Amino acid sequence: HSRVDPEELFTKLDRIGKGSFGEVYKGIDNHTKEVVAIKIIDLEEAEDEIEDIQQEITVLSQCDSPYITRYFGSYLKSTKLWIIMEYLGGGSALDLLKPGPLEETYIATILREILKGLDYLHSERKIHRDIKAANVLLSEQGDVKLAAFGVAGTPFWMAPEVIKQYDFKADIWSLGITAIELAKGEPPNSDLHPMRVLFLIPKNSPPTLEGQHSKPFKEFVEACLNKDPRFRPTAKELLKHKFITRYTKKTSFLTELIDRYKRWKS
């Protein structure tokens, strides 16, 4: 306690988040022997009026919800800042798509838990700024929690009002893109160059769920994907939508997708 090198209590092991997040490891607390996820960020010029870093940290310390990844604390020796957080060994929602497609029973359940996470953040006047399948993670019991980094971009899941210059209604748009991502495996205009997409989003019509899917699903996506942010529903209204209220499958039901991936990789 107080003035002690982070490695004295937290040790590093592997490297999860395949270079995706800013260098995140798997680790244990040498005292409690329980698993955690450690992110190390260099500080020595890399940056250095990147000081506003507290924004990500202060907000994380203000976030207390079972639908958001919890923040345990941050430590520094000189260079290299250690950010310790919750560990979710169930992988991301994108990793559950790699084996195959998802039935609407699972998709409706996941979006129900994402909305709960958005319901908390918006009530705390905080914005996630980056909603997608990669940032939606699961535990081993099937608990769906959102990410953490960025709370207060990634084209394809952007809102048109953000590109033109990020009110909380933009997260609803990103949720609408994610709804398509859960049903297609990839966001609309995925094969296009991300820069071209930034030019087409505010100008063209909002994407639509096409194919052999249910209408409440296609109506749910239509509701979120509205170029006028005023007409986009809240995170509380969508919890009462037809597509969500139908399937009342618990979070433990999402353990089937966790197992399907652990056998897929063989």
């Binding site: 090198d5 500080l43 020595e44 202060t58 604390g73 000189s78 260079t79 800042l81």
Partner: protein, 309 residues
């Protein structure tokens, strides 16, 4: 009525300090109740005055701060909002809450000690940084021995804290300038002895943060006497010239914004001049190749002119 809410929260807090829970439920619900009195549907002008007067007479403010660890997470956040709201409460040209904290000084010392407890350290800073906005409250802490505990908190190796105890450290030395200048004028020898250790710290953040504040303090028009005493000491010039060299870029950059004060001094001393001439040439060459981009060089020329003359 607020009078009933205070008494309901006062009795429930006495329970905490298995069969608990009920108290934790009451504490949580009553903390929210107080918040809606101060904020709302718009807060009523007499509801906040009945509440504040009952907080003084019951001594609940000192109670919540003391047993802050026992409160739940959301509760700790609610306590801060309730605390900061009545602290800003004014009755004409007076501030009744501030006058109350002056009578209950331990409330300030309790918040200050909160940095040693991580569970409430962040909350104990948000409330502390509000108190020091008022000069009478900022004065009690400044001339207290607990003020020197800040030099331990700023290098506490707990990043979410530490910096928070540094933001309070700056706000105590910069906000009330006449108050700070008086303190530095008297406590010069002890303060800068402690401050010197921050400039020799094995911490990139702590070192450059202290180096930035040091630049602001000396340059401020109120700390003139403190400045002239600092830029006359030989070691203070030796230290700045050393930081100008190796290690970091931003550190050697801020070392420049303090080193120039030594040079700009029209009242140099012989010990400060024997250093500038025994190392006469090297400075002229090092400044010409001093790094090196988009800001600055107009100062790097006038300094050369001074060392040359």
């Amino acid at each position: 009525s607020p009078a009933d809410i205070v008494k309901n929260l006062k009795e429930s807090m006495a329970v905490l300090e298995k069969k608990a829970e009920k108290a934790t439920e009451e504490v949580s619900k009553n903390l929210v109740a107080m918040k809606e009195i101060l904020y709302g549907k718009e807060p009523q002008t007499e509801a906040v005055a009945q509440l504040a007067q009952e907080l003084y007479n019951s001594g609940l403010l000192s109670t919540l701060v003391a047993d802050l660890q026992l409160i739940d997470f959301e509760g700790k956040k609610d306590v801060a909002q309730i605390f900061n709201n009545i602290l800003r409460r004014q009755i004409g040209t007076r501030t009744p809450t501030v006058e109350y904290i002056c009578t209950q000084q331990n409330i300030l010392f309790m918040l200050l000690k909160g940095y040693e407890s991580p569970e409430i350290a962040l909350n104990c800073g948000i409330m502390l940084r509000e108190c020091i906005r008022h000069e009478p409250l900022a004065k009690i802490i400044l001339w207290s021995e607990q003020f020197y505990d800040f030099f331990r908190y700023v290098e506490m190796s707990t990043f979410d804290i530490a910096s928070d105890a540094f933001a309070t450290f700056k706000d105590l030395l910069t906000r009330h300038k006449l108050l700070s200048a008086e303190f530095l004028e008297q406590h010069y020898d002890r303060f800068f002895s402690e401050y010197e250790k921050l400039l020799h710290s094995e911490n990139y953040v702590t070192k450059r943060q202290s180096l930035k504040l040091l630049g602001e303090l000396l340059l401020d028009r109120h700390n003139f006497t403190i400045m002239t005493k600092y830029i006359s000491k030989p070691e203070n010039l030796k230290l700045m010239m050393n930081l100008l060299r190796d290690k970091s870029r931003n550190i050697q950059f801020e070392a420049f914004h303090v080193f120039k004060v030594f040079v700009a001094n029209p009242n140099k001393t012989q010990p400060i001049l024997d250093i500038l001439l025994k190392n006469q040439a090297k400075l002229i060459e090092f400044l010409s190749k001093f790094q090196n981009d988009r800001t600055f060089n107009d100062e790097k020329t006038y300094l050369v002119k001074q060392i040359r003359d």
